[PDB]
């Protein structure tokens, strides 16, 4: 039975490839020849946040563009005031080996986790005034690679046990599992309408997951190497991914194939983080080259570089209004660009 | 404003606590323990006492933090980079596993998987700034098994008496040491067992020597 199922799967994949070629009347670069380029990028550092003792791994902007949360190896989950460089919180962790973090859209909760296989959710708005553990979502056999809030009741996580999960915060149990990947899942990026998200994994293929239905809608086997980071395009019909093969790939959901490859002759290092600008015109990507590259997402040309870090770049984010760019590296510094 | 100034004062208080935690982090030394469940690592930890698992313990005034990641089912390539700041990497493997095979029940020894892991971890560029410690467990069980089962089935390159447990120890040690292609680094080896209470002094001495070698390299004295 196995051989006939494999032959049917191969025929279905060939039909998908034939449909993708059939609808590929043009690429993105063949119609952007009539639009002006972005030109020179002259962004400068506005703030430097110096409060970390060891390697920074993750950050997430708040929806008010004023507060940010960052995670680091030293066991402090630090919440920063972006305007006055004040330290808002320095939350001690039970397990210092943290890889990801998230900030709730209401500002009431934060999430964290790592090699402990537990997603810890902390309450920022308590009667006691201190930040304490509210939930310990232990349900994985591999490392917790990414968490993002939908609200104060539901959180979407992806981990290293090939499973993605929708967790119910109030109950403490999983709402649903997403057992579609074959390798460790590294990152997820949520749609602004909270209905869909995109996850990527070591099997070099991105998957679109439906939060409520529990099924995968699209599989994109367009990569040569491990997918590291994903950022969703603001209009809800596209996304961009990064990987170890030094090519940043812009995918379109409705086209069901890739729109554009980003590569350059002097880049041989993998991609660790990606983010979009407010309009989606400028794509930001962090590399092992110790800098963050500004790429013109429509013209395909290299727009600029922000090089204010000494160690490997680990995290990159943009405010919801596009006001500021934040970068963080293993050198225990954060930088804010504008 | 008054709220701005109070927020700055609270930030300074947080910075004071961060400085205290920085001092404690300097005092703390991280240690990574690698190995599988069948190596008897729980008995090793029991001897050392007197998700990711933390094992803090104290010396007379030196604080050690042993890290056990062996419970996790994952691909090491996409998370092991966070252990660059570990002073020395410890590999705990048993000497009695040559009669045992992998879960696939094929013609592959668990020692071959251990060697593959050994070379895979050493060839990572993040760990080429630290030392390697090799713990060879179950030496008494090795002594019993070499008489039960002769040292012939997995060892085509062995030259010595087939019942000589010391020759077995030295040969397995030599095969492990020869796997390191970088002459800049040294492997600190120890022969341990379930009743060996001196493992903590081996760890202390090996970590001290690692720190001294890192200092001598940093000082451009060698």
């Amino acid at each position, epitope marked *: 039975e196995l051989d006939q199922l494999r032959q049917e799967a191969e025929q279905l994949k060939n039909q998908i490839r034939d449909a993708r070629k059939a609808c590929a009347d043009a690429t993105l670069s063949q119609i952007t020849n009539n639009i002006d380029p972005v030109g020179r990028i002259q962004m400068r550092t506005r703030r430097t946040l110096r409060g970390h003792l060891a390697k920074i791994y993750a950050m997430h902007w708040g929806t008010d563009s004023r507060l940010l949360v960052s995670a680091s190896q030293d066991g402090k989950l630090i919440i920063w005031d972006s305007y006055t460089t004040n330290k*808002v919180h320095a939350i001690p962790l039970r397990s210092s080996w943290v890889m990801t973090c998230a900030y709730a859209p209401s500002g009431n909760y934060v999430a964290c986790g790592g090699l402990d296989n537990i997603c810890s959710i902390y309450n920022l708005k308590t*009667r*006691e*005034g201190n930040v304490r553990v509210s939930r310990e979502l232990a349900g994985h056999t591999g490392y917790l690679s990414c968490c993002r809030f939908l609200d104060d009741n539901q959180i979407v996580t992806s981990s290293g046990d090939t499973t993605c999960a929708l967790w119910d915060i109030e109950t403490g149990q999983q709402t649903t599992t997403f057992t579609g990947h074959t390798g460790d899942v590294m990152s997820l990026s949520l749609a602004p309408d909270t209905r869909l998200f995109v996850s990527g994994a070591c099997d070099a293929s991105a998957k679109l997951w439906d939060v409520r239905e529990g099924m995968c809608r699209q599989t994109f086997t367009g990569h040569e190497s491990d997918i590291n980071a994903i950022c969703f395009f603001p209009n809800g019909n596209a996304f961009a991914t990064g990987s170890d093969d030094a090519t940043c790939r812009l995918f379109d959901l409705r086209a069901d194939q890739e729109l554009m490859t980003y590569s350059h002759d002097n880049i041989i290092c993998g991609i660790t983080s990606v983010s979009f600008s407010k309009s989606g015109r400028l794509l930001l990507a962090g590399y092992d080259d110790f800098n963050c590259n500004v790429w013109d997402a429509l013209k395909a040309d290299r727009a600029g570089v922000l090089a204010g870090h000494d160690n490997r770049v680990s995290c990159l984010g943009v405010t919801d209004d596009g006001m500021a760019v934040a970068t963080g590296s293993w050198d225990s510094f954060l930088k804010i660009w504008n | 404003s*008054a709220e701005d100034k109070a927020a700055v*004062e609270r930030s300074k208080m947080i910075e*004071k606590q961060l400085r205290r935690d920085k001092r404690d982090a300097r005092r703390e030394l991280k240690l990574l323990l690698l190995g599988t469940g069948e190596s008897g690592k729980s008995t090793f930890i029991k001897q050392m006492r007197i998700g990711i698992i933390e094992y803090p313990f104290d010396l007379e005034n030196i604080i050690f933090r042993m890290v056990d990641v062996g419970a996790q089912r994952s691909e090491r390539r996409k998370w092991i980079h966070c252990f660059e700041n570990v002073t020395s990497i410890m590999f705990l493997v048993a000497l009695s596993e040559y009669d045992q095979v992998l879960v696939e029940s094929d013609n592959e020894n668990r020692m071959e998987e251990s060697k593959a892991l050994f070379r895979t971890i050493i060839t990572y560029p993040w760990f080429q700034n630290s030392s390697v410690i090799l713990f060879l467990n179950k030496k008494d069980l090795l002594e019993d098994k070499i008489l039960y089962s002769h040292l012939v089935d997995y060892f085509p390159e062995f030259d010595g008496p087939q019942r000589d447990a010391q020759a077995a120890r030295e040969f397995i040690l030599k095969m492990f040491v020869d796997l390191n292609p970088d002459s800049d680094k040294i492997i600190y080896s120890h022969f341990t067992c379930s009743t060996d209470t001196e493992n903590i002094r081996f760890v202390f001495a090996a970590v001290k020597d690692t720190i001294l070698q890192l200092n001598l390299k940093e000082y451009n004295l060698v």
Partner: single-chain antibody
Amino acid sequence: VQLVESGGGLVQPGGSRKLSCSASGFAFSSFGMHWVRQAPEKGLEWVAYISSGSGTIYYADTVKGRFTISRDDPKNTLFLQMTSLRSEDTAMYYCVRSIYYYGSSPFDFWGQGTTLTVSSADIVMTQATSSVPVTPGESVSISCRSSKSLLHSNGNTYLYWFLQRPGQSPQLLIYRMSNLASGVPDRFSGSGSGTAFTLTISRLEAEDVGVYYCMQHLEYPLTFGAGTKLE
């Protein structure tokens, strides 16, 4: 989350007393602490502030040089040493906890209170109306004026609104005129300019009886309004 106060009673003029405030149920050491006073025929008058870690201390102009504020974090107890006591210092005293940062909710818990009986450039807060008779279910608009503009260059206007029910300690209603305090129902709101303030109440409940305070937090010393009662 309790604050149990002691060290009060009836004293003679010229004496001294040590007040205590026992804190329980919360992370006391991270909080700033206030002492607040209220005469029987007057509204609340702010006395003193000590920051977390004792990094800074502030006194009112009529308080400085006579009263000493102190704290003991490992026993979670606040102290106040008051010397040269005058007849004007007879008041109900309150132990108050606060946290100051962007998005925080300071003054969200007021203590039990204690009774002590004794045998120029500041911003003045004006509430001309002493009381308004009301009917449940109707809306209410209560104004407040400040002598200075409270609009800082960061965009925030540092006005707070409080409710002091009869026989109860004051409860926080609104801070910075946009962020409703936790535990307070959504029928309360505020609005206004940098100097002219309005508290708007829709669908008034019986439990809303009490004295309403407006307060400025632009510069130290802190000052309180006269207070408007709903009858």
